[PDB]
């Protein structure tokens, strides 16, 4: 793998999606920009269990963007607190969680319909990543735009402990073009997004296992 002509990123233990989420052990890759992404077979995650029902398209899109360029946008989420600490996903000496998502639960044991809205003012497309926290008793989620309703229903049900946390953080993606206005509604446990990732128009991704070296 040559370095001089094209920008490579490698990654000890980060799958491209894990760097996208900002897993605590892969947090060093924030805001990184690349031309080609390269993936170790050692890749593993230490946070909450998770699953992207459209893994392939998300991988291709993020790789083609060639940038994370995250920017916190200060969504309202005023009704309840946006931080959440899990026994897994340890980062440091205490509990932690993804660095690009929220684990809302609901303060005062009540979850009002949040009805969050965020206008996409910029001239370039934006991508917002959110999830649904399948527990292990009530709640429905919907991410609405001018083109789709990414309806999701929390698939409640018991499950096997995977990292001492019997649940899932199923992750979806949402494009929000200029002029369109993201709309979000909820009734229960929602993995509230923290901010968009920019998209930039010939980068790609290759799953090579060659060593790392400095050469042309």
């Amino acid at each position: 793998i040559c370095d001089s002509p094209h920008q490579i990123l490698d990654g000890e233990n980060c799958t491209l999606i894990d760097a996208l989420l900002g897993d605590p052990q892969c947090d060093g890759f924030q805001n990184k920009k690349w031309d080609l992404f390269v993936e170790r077979s050692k890749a593993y995650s230490n946070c909450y269990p998770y699953d992207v029902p459209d893994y392939a398209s998300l991988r291709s899109l993020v790789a083609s963007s060639g940038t994370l360029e995250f920017k916190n946008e200060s969504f309202n989420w005023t009704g309840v607190t946006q931080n959440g600490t899990s026994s897994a996903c340890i980062r440091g000496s205490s509990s932690s969680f993804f660095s690009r998502l929220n684990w809302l639960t609901h303060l005062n044991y009540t979850y009002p319909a949040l009805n969050v809205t965020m206008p996409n003012k910029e001239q370039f497309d934006k991508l917002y990543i959110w999830g649904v926290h399948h527990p292990g008793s009530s709640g429905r989620i919907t991410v609405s735009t001018k083109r789709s309703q990414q309806a999701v229903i929390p698939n409640i049900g018991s499950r096997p402990r995977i990292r001492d946390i019997p649940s899932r953080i199923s992750i979806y993606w949402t494009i929000v073009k200029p002029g369109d206005i993201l709309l979000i509604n909820s009734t229960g446990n929602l993995i509230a997004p923290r901010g968009y990732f920019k998209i930039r128009s010939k980068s790609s991704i290759m799953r090579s296992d060659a060593p790392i070296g400095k050469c042309k």
Partner: antibody, heavy 123, light 104 residues
């Protein structure tokens, strides 16, 4: 070193009560969650039962749901899979398998096994 | 519980050749298990792409989207056995129906 032995298998008429015993040695029995796995002659494996960690929970499989009563006594380090209402689909070897982490942290991963006891049901 | 399928029940290949194993189920926690004929199975893989203790690096797991795969870059006589793909998401753990590697 840790080792597992299955016992009590053999021939029993359908519907008769049966109880395997899977003892353990080389580690404190509360250190892991126990399991049971089966395979009939010439077919693929299948799941049977489970105790999560320290015996406050149990979760069986579909085809055998409700029939069995897996239980343990932490003061003697002994496992048992109490069996009721045997049926002709239950001809197979029964392993008692452990997992690769303590107290329950990755449940669903097995590294240690016994030899596997044969249980046969027929006239 | 998911209905987990696997590659053809028997794949015949000569030692040293490259092999691939499929476990299309329709993303994570699909540990594989190795059993030698007449032996209690043993752990080979503990996640879609991570190897357990002692396994040679020749075995490599990849794939995602309920379309996982296990590619063997070079077979060895000890590799000719039965391989079952597990799955941990949801309570009922359903091993695949299994497949056999035979010395061609």
């Amino acid at each position: 070193q840790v080792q597992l032995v299955e016992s009590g298998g053999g021939v029993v008429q359908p519907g008769r009560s049966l109880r395997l015993s899977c003892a353990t040695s080389g580690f404190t029995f509360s250190s892991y969650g126990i399991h049971w796995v089966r395979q009939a002659p010439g077919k693929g494996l299948g799941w049977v039962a489970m105790i999560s960690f320290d015996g406050s929970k149990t979760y069986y499989a579909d085809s055998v749901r409700g029939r069995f009563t897996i239980s343990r006594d932490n003061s003697k380090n002994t496992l048992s899979l109490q069996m009721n209402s045997l049926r002709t689909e239950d001809t197979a070897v029964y392993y008692c398998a452990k997992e690769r982490d303590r107290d329950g942290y990755n449940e669903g991963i097995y590294d240690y096994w016994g030899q596997g006891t044969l249980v046969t049901v027929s006239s | 519980e998911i209905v987990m399928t696997q590659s053809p029940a028997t794949l015949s290949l000569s030692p040293g050749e490259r092999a691939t194993l499929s476990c299309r189920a329709s993303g994570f926690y699909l540990a594989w298990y190795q059993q030698k004929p007449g032996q209690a199975p043993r752990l080979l893989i503990y996640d879609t792409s991570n190897r357990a203790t002692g396994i040679p690096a020749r075995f490599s797991g990849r794939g995602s989207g309920t379309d996982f795969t296990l590619t063997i870059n070079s077979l060895e006589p000890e590799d000719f056995a039965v391989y079952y793909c597990q799955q941990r998401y949801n309570w009922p753990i359903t091993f695949g129906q299994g497949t056999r590697l035979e010395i061609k």
